[PDB]
């Protein structure tokens, strides 16, 4: 019953974009890189996380739409991101646990609002701690240095190279 997962990193290792601007983060973000500690079945035709749409509300929470591609069909999932103790930090909307997570955390590590963003996610289910880092662009195209940073950050959190992927994107689900 001790978890065999790669341990979640201390929060001291997960920065927040300084002077985080919630109004600018707002909008559509394409998934460019993904990395996390869940073990993922080797699949010769995996489902894809296409993009995430962050809609800033009057109460300063986000209405989040996850755009997925599953067996050749676009799918759309909704979450709410409620602000946390610092700017750029969030938790998921109250959701029933068990079997939902007992805690969540979102940290926008870095972003320049108009090009790239890198977001850290943690979901804890009692003893077991899952985490994920997503590299996002306003387009599907990012700079090598921005990608190389995401690689280095993911590694700094204890993730081996094989848990760090840049999925080939779809031409679908958005326009």
């Amino acid at each position: 019953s001790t978890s065999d997962l790669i341990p979640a990193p201390p929060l001291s290792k997960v920065p927040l974009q300084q002077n985080f601007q919630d109004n600018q983060f707002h909008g559509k973000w394409y998934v460019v890189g993904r990395a996390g500690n869940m073990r993922l079945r080797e699949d010769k035709d995996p489902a894809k996380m296409v993009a995430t749409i962050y809609e800033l509300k009057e109460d300063k929470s986000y209405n989040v739409t996850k755009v997925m591609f599953q067996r050749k069909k676009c799918k759309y999932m909704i979450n709410t991101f409620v602000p946390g103790s610092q700017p750029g930090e969030f938790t998921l909307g109250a959701i029933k646990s068990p079997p939902g997570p007992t805690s969540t955390l979102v940290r926008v590590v870095s972003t320049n609002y108009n090009q790239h963003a890198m977001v850290f996610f943690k979901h804890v289910f009692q003893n077991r701690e899952y985490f994920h880092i997503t590299l996002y662009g306003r387009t599907k195209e990012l700079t090598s240095e921005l990608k190389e940073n995401f690689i280095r950050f993911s590694k700094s959190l204890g993730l081996p190279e094989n848990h760090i992927v840049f999925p080939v994107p779809i031409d679908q689900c958005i326009d």
């Binding site: 019953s1 001790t2 065999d4 993904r34 990395a35 996390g36 869940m38 073990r39 079945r41 995996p46 489902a47 894809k48 996380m49 996850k66 997925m68 591609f69 599953q70 067996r71 799918k75 999932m77 959701i95 029933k96 068990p98 079997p99 939902g100 997570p101 996610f121 979901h123 289910f125 077991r128 899952y130 985490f131 994920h132 997503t134």
Partner: protein, 92 residues
Amino acid sequence: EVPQLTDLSFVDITDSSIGLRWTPLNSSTIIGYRITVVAAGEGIPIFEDFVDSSVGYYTVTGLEPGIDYDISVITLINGGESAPTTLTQQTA
């Protein structure tokens, strides 16, 4: 190495729930099963729960219609576990 369930089945699929059935494994090494549910393409599970070794039946609740979920059931022993038995099922 720990035995996987070889007969995980889905039953009573609705727009918001999926029923899991399996035959409990018998070895006294087994302490229970973990159920982990991931909306397919997501990087973290949405749902994860435990049942003791007596259980051959679990209903996943609070799902979204028309989404594929990768549902894993993992055999547990003290300090160890199986490879996951994972299957994908769409809600209604």
